[PDB]
Write an enzyme that holds these catalytic residues in place. Structure first.
Site, PDB file in Angstrom:
ATOM      1  N   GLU B  17     -33.977  -2.736 -11.082  1.00 23.25           N
ATOM      2  CA  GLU B  17     -34.050  -1.281 -11.035  1.00 23.25           C
ATOM      3  C   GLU B  17     -32.796  -0.755 -10.337  1.00 23.25           C
ATOM      4  O   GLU B  17     -32.336   0.355 -10.611  1.00 23.25           O
ATOM      5  CB  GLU B  17     -35.292  -0.823 -10.247  1.00 23.25           C
ATOM      6  CG  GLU B  17     -36.635  -1.285 -10.808  1.00 23.25           C
ATOM      7  CD  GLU B  17     -37.812  -0.961  -9.881  1.00 23.25           C
ATOM      8  OE1 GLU B  17     -37.701  -1.203  -8.661  1.00 23.25           O
ATOM      9  OE2 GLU B  17     -38.855  -0.478 -10.374  1.00 23.25           O
ATOM     10  N   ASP B 204     -45.206   2.608 -18.303  1.00 22.68           N
ATOM     11  CA  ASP B 204     -46.451   2.321 -18.999  1.00 22.68           C
ATOM     12  C   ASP B 204     -47.488   3.399 -18.741  1.00 22.68           C
ATOM     13  O   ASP B 204     -47.440   4.084 -17.717  1.00 22.68           O
ATOM     14  CB  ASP B 204     -47.000   0.962 -18.552  1.00 22.68           C
ATOM     15  CG  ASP B 204     -47.136   0.854 -17.045  1.00 22.68           C
ATOM     16  OD1 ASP B 204     -46.103   0.732 -16.359  1.00 22.68           O
ATOM     17  OD2 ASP B 204     -48.280   0.897 -16.540  1.00 22.68           O
TER      18      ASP B 204
HETATM   19  N1  LIG Z   1     -49.282   0.582 -13.857  1.00 24.21           N
HETATM   20  C1  LIG Z   1     -48.568   0.300 -12.773  1.00 24.21           C
HETATM   21  N2  LIG Z   1     -49.193   0.141 -11.513  1.00 24.21           N
HETATM   22  C2  LIG Z   1     -48.440  -0.152 -10.403  1.00 24.21           C
HETATM   23  N3  LIG Z   1     -47.062  -0.320 -10.379  1.00 24.21           N
HETATM   24  C3  LIG Z   1     -46.490  -0.156 -11.628  1.00 24.21           C
HETATM   25  N4  LIG Z   1     -45.150  -0.263 -11.915  1.00 24.21           N
HETATM   26  C4  LIG Z   1     -45.037  -0.034 -13.242  1.00 24.21           C
HETATM   27  N5  LIG Z   1     -46.219   0.219 -13.855  1.00 24.21           N
HETATM   28  C5  LIG Z   1     -47.135   0.141 -12.841  1.00 24.21           C
END
Ligand SMILES: Nc1ncnc2[nH]cnc12
Ligand SMILES: Nc1ncnc2[nH]cnc12
Lengths: 244, 246
Positions: B17, B204
């Site tokens: 990142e 996501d």
């Molecule tokens: N769904 C998620 N929960 C926690 N950290 C994350 N980082 C990226 N997606 C995530």
């Protein structure tokens, strides 16, 4: 050379006070871990040992002990860098499993520690989240003081979710707390031996409410914790890490 | 006498990142171990216009090799970075999960309003609020009016998945975003009275139809690029301004 400096990492003032009085420790006034922090550091000297007790202190907004893995990790880190202790002792109350042989009032030594609430479903991250770490082996201390020993499972929740329970049963822990594995993580990073003294205040697999039983036994159990901590300090005095 | 911001520290959990941002501003990896002596933490330093830029990452875990993600390492590097680097402001930038029902879309880079924990459950008076650890991000009205980033509440926990217990609490705290470090970084920043801002890029959709880990990793590379773009605009906006002009 024998051990000469010991730092106790204790989450609650209620757990620390009995030890502070027993060894006649004094509250540090020069904010050695950083200015403006709520952390409390008690210092003293028993026999040939320098003794420090560090606590996360009161939350600025609420006013209660800043329990949990984050504050515990911070004060462990800060106290190690500032005091350079020979050994760290994470002493505090915990939940215990009756089926595992734990009884209210028992003050346990810890074999190894893990986290039960850092679930990461990715190949290597998974083992990382669990963070299995062995406590510093102290066979003679265990034998001489005749203490019970078992695995400790750490999480930031006082209750136990269905998911938490499944994982705790799986890692076969005898004890459950909210700081241990984090203190071990930091001690590992800084290569400082760490030992744990965990006093059972409630039975997770019992019938009484966790919160209620915990508060009900806090006073008497922290007194028991002090009793064992005192024996541990007297045992460590004059000894080297190799003879614990 | 108040003066323009002179130093900024980015706290980033994954090297992946951070690299995009490091390369963008040509930051150099300090090899003389600035922050700590014998730690896996990585510190990249550099200069852009009138701002000193520091980027800190927890680094590789000695035992498993992967990025040392989670609240504990994030809190430690934030604490150590503040005491050693004395930044004017901290920016926690990273990827996160988002809720489609809350208006989040893959690729969105959010500016966080406030942050809470969803996995520190202490079901008793006073301690319950402590566990939640509600903290407000530093107010940056002008930045938001310039970059027009979406905003929302962030909920932090040390698990990448979401248990039934986690879900009930996240839905209840009305979070739009979910991550693994935010609330801990805010906790430390508050302890040391350092303003903190968050840039969280959605990789996501937690309430979507794809597996979390799968979608997260699938979009990691592309979304981290979007994160860099926004981080760059934020840096150029901050330059020359003082905390009150944000
Ligand atoms: N769904 C998620 N929960 C926690 N950290 C994350 N980082 C990226 N997606 C995530
Ligand atoms: N059951 C329990 N779980 C976590 N920490 C505790 N401290 C005391 N009892 C506990």
């Amino acid at each position: 050379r024998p051990i000469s400096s010991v730092v106790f990492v204790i989450a609650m003032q209620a757990e620390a006070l009995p030890l502070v009085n027993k060894f006649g420790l004094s509250e540090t006034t020069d904010s050695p871990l950083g200015k403006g922090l709520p952390w409390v550091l008690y210092h003293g000297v028993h026999k040939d040992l320098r003794i420090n007790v560090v606590c996360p202190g009161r939350d600025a907004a609420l006013g209660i002990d800043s329990v949990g893995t984050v504050p515990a990790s911070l004060i462990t880190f800060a106290s190690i860098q500032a005091l350079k202790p020979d050994i760290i002792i994470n002493a505090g109350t915990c939940g215990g499993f009756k089926v595992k042989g734990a009884n209210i009032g028992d003050v346990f030594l810890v074999s190894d520690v893990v986290f039960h609430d850092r679930r990461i479903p990715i190949p290597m991250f998974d083992l990382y989240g669990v963070g299995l770490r062995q406590a510093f082996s102290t066979p003679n201390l265990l034998k001489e003081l005749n203490l019970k020993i078992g695995r400790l499972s750490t999480g930031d929740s006082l209750d136990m979710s269905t998911q938490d329970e499944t994982l705790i049963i799986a890692n076969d822990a005898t004890l459950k707390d909210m700081e241990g594995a984090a203190v071990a993580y930091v001690a590992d990073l800084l290569k400082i031996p760490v030992v744990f003294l965990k006093a059972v205040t409630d039975l997770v697999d019992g019938d009484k409410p966790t919160a209620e039983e915990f508060l009900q036994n806090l006073t008497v159990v922290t007194a028991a914790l002090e009793g064992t901590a005192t024996k541990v300090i007297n045992f460590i005095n004059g000894r080297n890490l190799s003879d614990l």
